[PDB]
């Protein structure tokens, strides 16, 4: 059937050409349909993990930036609870508006979100557009999870994304107790009197 317990939606946001989709498609198992990016805009792949004996579906929505979808993508951040700003260390002008994406995503996403920040394409280690310690600091006074996100031969994502679903899980994993259902008696022949 379906049988999962919670379902989160997590946007991937950034400038165009920073390498979000190739980061996605290694990492999620698949989405069963290649489909296309730019017909409705934003595409989406699923990922199922389990936390704390609860089973979680997480739906990653990565967003394109072709300047046509102006009102459309801002409608797509409505209700968005998990977030990931991706930037590349090779090029440098994406970091000038990573803060622009951050203040657009603090706007109209939820009451509270948990935004990660990820540096794609660490494979070309000899081309650092921005120092990692500055982005690490900018994550530190913005309450953001920071990962190297090196491209190829990496798991940085397979521990950081699980940690993102943990932090967003106890943001909404409120409370429950038990569903045991073992209390049985009263098998008589009913000498009733009304």
């Amino acid at each position: 059937g379906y049988d999962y317990d919670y379902l989160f939606k997590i946007v991937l946001i950034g400038d165009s050409g920073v390498g979000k989709s190739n980061l996605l498609s290694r990492f999620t198992t698949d989405e069963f349909n290649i489909e296309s990016k730019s017909t409705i805009g934003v595409e989406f792949a699923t990922r199922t993990i389990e936390v704390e004996n609860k089973k979680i579906k997480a739906q990653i929505w990565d967003t394109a930036g072709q300047e046509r979808y102006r009102a459309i993508t801002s409608a797509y951040y409505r209700g968005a609870v998990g977030a990931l700003i991706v930037y590349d260390i090779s090029k440098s002008s994406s970091y000038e508006n990573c803060n622009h994406w951050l203040t657009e995503l603090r706007e109209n996403a939820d009451d509270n979100v948990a935004v990660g920040l990820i540096g794609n394409k660490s494979d070309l280690a000899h081309l650092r557009a921005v120092p990692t310690d500055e982005a690490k600091n900018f994550a530190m006074e913005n309450q953001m999870l920071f990962t190297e996100t090196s491209a190829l031969n990496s798991d940085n994502v397979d521990k950081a994304f699980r940690e993102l679903i943990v932090a967003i899980f106890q943001m909404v994993s409120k409370h429950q107790v038990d569903l045991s259902g073992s209390g049985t008696n009263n098998m008589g022949s009913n000498g009733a009197p009304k």
Partner: protein, 56 residues
Amino acid sequence: YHVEASHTSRIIVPIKKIDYKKYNFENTPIPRIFPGRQFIQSGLNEEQTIEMRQKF
């Protein structure tokens, strides 16, 4: 020499040249006092890097 309170005195120091086939002046440029650091892109043209190396 003697310089009193404002009087400049241009010292004329004679030296020789240097030989371009004796020193290489295209070696690792502007060496850092301490090794390591961020290792950010230079952000300058290779030709500019040549004249900055010579002028240092």
